[PDB]
Structure formats: C-alpha cells, structure tokens
Write a new protein. Structure first.
Lengths: 98, 97, 97, 97, 97, 98, 98, 97, 97, 98
C-alpha cells in the first residue's frame, strides 16, 4: 500500500508548503488507484449486490478526487493555468470539450 | 497500487463465489490503507484546510470499510462466527468490549 | 512481507495514540491477506489433509480479524459510527443486512 | 516504473471502453508522480540551471494532467458530476473555491 | 501481500505434489512474517491492552507454523532428515540443543 | 532481495533479544524461499546436470532451515510449545504424525 | 512510483555535484518509462482521440529526455566522450549512424 | 531486478517495431540505473582499488547508453527531433549548450 | 522473495538452453543475496552462538555460488572468456590478481 | 532499480571492509540481472542490428562480472576456498570440470 508502517515513521516536523502540494497529488493517486481497483472488481462480479456497492463506492472515490483537486488547485496556481492549457490542447487536437 | 494495469488483464471469466469473498477482503485492505495514509498526512499537515478535508475523507473511507464488511459477512458465515469469537477473546484477556 | 528487517529498525520511541490505530489497521490488513492466501491455496490443494488444515488456519485468522477490530473500534469511535453507517448504506441499496 | 516489460506483454485485443478510462487514470497517476519527483529534485538542487529545467518540466507535466483529465471527464460522466460535487464539498467545509 | 489479486488468477489445474510442498513452505513464510510484524508492533505499543493481544495473536501464529511444518515434514521426507542434520550441526558448533 | 543495500545501512547498536528472534525467522524465510526457487528450477530443467545440482543445493538449504530453527527454538520457548501444539492440532484433525 | 512519500523525506542538505548527476539520470529514467507507458497505451487504444493525445504527450516526454540529457552532458564530460564512443561502436558493428 | 524469471516467460512472438523501441528505452533505463549504482558505491568506497574499478565500469556503462541510444534514435525519428528541441529549450532557459 | 507463488505458475514446457543459463545466473543472485543477508545479520548479533551459525551458513552459501558458477561456465563459454578478460583488466588497473 | 534515489541518501561515512564485500556482491547481482535482461531482449529481437548490439553489450557485462569477482575474491578469502569446493562438488556429482 501507500501508507507507511509506523515502525518506520520518525518524522517530527510538519509538511512544508511544497510537501503539502505533494501529499495532495499523492492523495489523488491513491483515489485514482482505488477507482481502478473497484471498477475492475465490478467488471468480474456477477453478484449484482457486490457490483452495485463496488460501483457506488467508486463513485464516492471520484468525489474524493474532486476534493483533493480543489485543495491542490488552490495551493498550486501553476496547475490552474496548465490545467486550462491542457484542456485547450485537447480541444484543438480532437474537438473534445467540457 | 493494488489495481492492475489493463495491459496485463487477460481474465474473461467472472469471479467465483470464493473469489468474490477474496476481492471484498482486498477492498477492505485498500480502504484500511487509505485511512492510514490520510490519517498520516493529516498528522503532518498544519494547513487546517488540508487537514480538515483529509480527516473528512478518512471518515468516509471508514464507512466504505463497513460497506465491504457488510457484504463479506453476508457471504462468509464463518467470518460472522469468528468475528464474535475474536470479540469475546479480547474481552476475556483485556475486558475491552 | 509486511514486517521490517531489524537492520532497518532505528525507532526508539513508542507509538502515539494515532499510530496505535494505524498498526491495528495494518494488523487487520495482514490477517485479511493471510485469509486470501490460505483460501487460494485450499482451492488448488487436492490433498484433503492439506486443504483441511489450510481452511482451519484460515478460520483462526478470521478470529484474529475480530480481535484486532475490537481493539480498533475501542480506540476509534469514528470507525464505530461509520461502520454502522456503512452497514445501513448496504441495506438501503441492496437489502443485505 | 509503470510501463510493462514487453517480454511480459501478451495482450492482442484493444482496450474496452472501461479499460480506456482506467489507463487514463493511470496516465494521470504517472504524471502526478513525475510532478512530485521533479518538484522534490528541484528542492535540493543548488544548481540554478538544473532547478529551472526541473520546474519547467514539472510545469509541462501539469499540462499533461489537464490533457488526460479532459479525456477522462469526456469518457467518465460520473467523474464530471463527482468532481463538481467534490469542489462544492471543499467550498462548504473550508470556503476554498 | 502474498495473496494474489483474483483478477490475475487464471490457473485452473490443481497443485502437483511438488507444488503442494512449495505452498506449505510459503504458508510458513507468511506465518513467520506475521510473527515478526506483531512482535515489532508489541515492542512500540505502550497500550498494555493492544500489546497483550498482539503477543497472544503472535503466539497463535507460532502454532500455525507447527501445523504447516507438520504437513510439510509428512510430505517432504528429505526435510525430516535434513532438519535432524541441521540440529546436529548446531550442536557440534555451539553446544545448543 | 532480502539483504540491505549498504548505502542505506545506518544502524550501529546490536540486535536486542527480540530482534535476534526476528532475524532468525527472517533467515528461515530466506531459506524456504531458496528451496522453493531451486525446486521450481529443477522441475523445468531437462538438463540432468543442472537438475542434479539444484536438487542437491536445495537439500543443503533444508539443513540450513534446521540450523536456524535450532537457534530460534532455543531463544523462543513459546515457539517450542506452540510447535508441539501445532503438531497435535494436525494429528487431531487428520491423524498425521510428523 | 519514483517520487518519495513526503512522510519519509528527512533530508536537509542540498544535492552534491555527484548527486545532481544521479538525479538527472533518474529524471531520464522517469521520462523513458513514461514514453514506454504511453506508447503501450496508444497501441491498444481504439479510441483515435485518446490515441492522438497519448502520442502527443509521448512526443513531449521525448523532448524532456533531451532537456535532462543536455544538463547531464554539461555536468558529465565523461558521458560526452562515452556517448560518442558508444555511437562509434554501433557504427562499426552494424553500420547504423546518425 | 528488471530481467524476468524464466519460470514466468510464456511469450513466443518476436518484438514488434514498437516493442523494439520500448526495450531499447528499457535497456537505457538499466544502464542509467547501473551508472547511479556504481557511482554511489564508488563515493563510499575508501578502498582505492575498488573505487578505481567501479568508476571504470561505470564509464563503460556510459558507453552502453550511447550504443542503445544510437539504435533508438535510428528507429525513433521523433526522438531525434525532440532531442534537439530539448537541447534548444535548455539553451533558451539556462544558456547551457 | 525470488520464488514464484505456484498459483501463478502456468508453464508446462522445459527451459530452453538460453533459459537454463538465465536461471543459473538467477540462482547465483539468490546465493549472493543470502550471503549479504547473513553477513549483515552476523554483524549486529552479539549472541556469539547466533553469529557462529550465520557465518557458517554463509560459508556454505559461498560454496553454492561455486556450484552454480561451474554449471554456468560449462553452459556459457562466453562467460569463461570474459571472466578471464575481467580478471586481466583488474590486474592491469590495480595489480590485484 | 538497484540504485538509491539521492533524496533518500543520508549516509556520510565510508563502507567498512564487510560492507565493501557486500557492495561487490550487489554489483555482481546487478551485472547478472543485466545479462539476463539483454539475453532475453535479444531472444525476441528479429532486428539483427539490435540483436547484435544486445549480445555485444551482454558480452561486456560478463567481463564486468569478472572484474567485480576478482575484487571480491581478493577481499573474501573464504569465497576463494568455497568457490574451489563448489567446483569440486560439481565435478564429483556430474563430471563437469570448470
Ligand atoms: Fe477515497
Ligand atoms: Fe474508500
Ligand atoms: Fe493471524
Ligand atoms: Fe508528462
Ligand atoms: Fe497464522
Ligand atoms: Fe541456505
Ligand atoms: Fe516528461
Ligand atoms: Fe551496461
Ligand atoms: Fe545456498
Ligand atoms: Fe556492467
């Protein structure tokens, strides 16, 4: 997993502003990995009760992506600009728009 | 991470009833790992806005543990009995209930 | 494995209250992995004696899940609340109880 | 790394629409990891020229996040809704908008 | 962990006799790793209740070592002979018995 | 592998009593892994010379299991008791006597 | 991934001259891994819009290889010589040159 | 390591042209990792004989980077263009050439 | 570890001559790793009995290196030539023989 | 890979004599892994130019094994004796002499 075994944790000082941006990106990584995991599980579950819960949990992890992204964009103005630039590049090359 | 790179996925058959139990346990593993991760992040985040969201997300992951646990207990009657036995064992050794 | 090579262990101070909650979740992770491992081994073991022991050991690991979860719930009141909430959500969405 | 050693690639059929969503999330994972890597490197680089390139490359990886995100949102309408809902949740709990 | 993600399990045929010996050794590996994990956790746990349960679970994993060992020795006569030889080698070199 | 890259080793003090037990369990893990590796290799080697040596090396690793086990049992009296208890549990459930 | 979880970052000194070389090589590793990942994804994407973006991002990662290579060559004169020597060896053995 | 355990190799088809590019990039990855490894070892080796060999081997691994690079550039014309573009970008941003 | 979980072993055909060379190199890797592990353990073991067995086992693993090396050299004549060439290069650069 | 991310390197003291033996064994491990990697790549490369370079590089890694082995044997006298003992054991069991 991504969490650290407490036996190995010997950090005492709080995150710097830049490390705070990094743990937000890592939190998004964790959520995206969880979404992929549950979507994959749902694909092979012919038990409709298990599939329904897997898909509903995955939906809630997608909201977690939004929460961590809102914090990241607030702390990373460069990401705001480049996110818009990335959207524009996709539009120009493919026509896909929000 | 725990999810598989789709390039490597070649399975076609659906999960067996035994495999359904195993992915539910793996789903609980994933949630418990996420809780530890966000609780650790919150511990070192002095930005109170970031800490607040980390702890609120962690709270929602704890509910996900319950959802998967509920499905597992419904499909694993042995886990229901042994969960009770484990609770009783802790009570007899420590008094915690 | 999940245990640390002692060559790398240099921590000398005890777990904080929050770290105590994290090692209990990690202990549950270890037990859930062991259950999956032994249930998988039993599936492919045509030796009935080996299968019988694998399933009996797995049963005892399921009790270990209960023991660690009893401690976790005692130290994590939020997990108690969210566990019930998770059970209720599955009930509302699937009827499973 | 995240890429597969071609020696292990036996897949011959194209990604399903569900797998397409998954590789887009994995691409975002790869970009976010690269940003963290280069931002961390720049922190410890006293060589001003190396730092400047590290930060400029990281900036360009942030645009890649946007490109993959645009594709993901176009194929994952649920993510569009939950992204909005996630933004609103942060705004309510912290005022960040 | 050591258990396989069911998404990746495509084996259908049962373990051979030689593979049965290998999974028993792997089961012993899993138990020994769990013992080390729980013994390490107990070392840093000031909560006497958590320490008591950690040590009692670890004790039960030591019994699992015996169960898997008994099956392995029953299926691996070479291991029986070499176990004795290993005990004797330690005797001649250290006096430990 | 299981060994540590010396670049990362910064420990100076010797193993405690419990750490000595843990490295003995880790040594057994390494031996059992090596046995499985060489038995697997021998299974697919139709070169009789390679197979013969793989099986002979594997036999000697099984003796290493005994050596590390002897030290572990001498330092871990709880393991002595539970090992006997484990054998009896197998006997009660299957009749096997190893 | 290759980035470190900030929870484990306890380094305070800046990189030495030799370490600067090593992180530039690691940056090239990260870029080459990303190129392989996106090229592999593009191979199995039947969605032409997705494939188009994957290939364009991969192209931009190839430019990042050049950026990190330029810095590395400026700091590693031995790499300059051996790069030329490596090019020459391929010439003599295969005739490939450019 | 990066090499595959032959027990797991079941591929029969030769590499495609795309896969050939990918294994060349992976070969470069292996060489760059070896260079970092030996450079790190040499830094902490007080034995001047060991240091001398480590640096001489690392020098030869740097030539291997050139060999694999030459093949890659010959098969990946896009990499030729972007390599020059990357050089130019560094010149514009830092003055390095 | 280096051994494969039998659940994942789907191979049915024997090793090719090239694969035999590769598993011999992998066997040497396993032995060298074991030597480093036990040599490291012996370093921090003030229990003289434990140290004495660790060093004696490590000695026996060093003989295993020779056994696998003899087979490798017998199947890899190129390695014989390059081994001697490597010895001569060290002699030329350091005088060690 | 086997190299350490410099962000995690905090050792400020040279290798002991025992650690020097360990990094030489680790260097041999790295070379043997590279040989296996390049031998495997050459197996699937029907491009004869790429195959030729893969095999020639692999040949040079085999010389690196010899260089590191020479240093190890010079610093590890037990390995010299046990290497001879291993060769003799193989000759006894198979008749192979190397
Ligand atoms: Fe989540
Ligand atoms: Fe969750
Ligand atoms: Fe257990
Ligand atoms: Fe990118
Ligand atoms: Fe157990
Ligand atoms: Fe051994
Ligand atoms: Fe890039
Ligand atoms: Fe090389
Ligand atoms: Fe050995
Ligand atoms: Fe080399």
């Amino acid at each position: 997993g991504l969490s650290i075994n407490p036996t190995l944790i010997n950090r005492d000082k709080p995150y710097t502003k830049e490390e705070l941006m990094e743990i937000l990106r890592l939190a998004i990584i964790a959520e995206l990995d969880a979404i992929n995991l549950y979507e994959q599980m749902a694909r092979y579950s012919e038990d409709e009760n298990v599939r329904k819960i897997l898909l509903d949990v995955a939906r809630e992890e997608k909201a977690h992506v939004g929460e961590f992204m809102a914090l990241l964009l607030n702390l990373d103005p460069e990401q705001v600009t480049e996110l818009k630039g990335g959207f524009e590049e996709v539009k120009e090359l493919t026509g896909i728009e929000a």
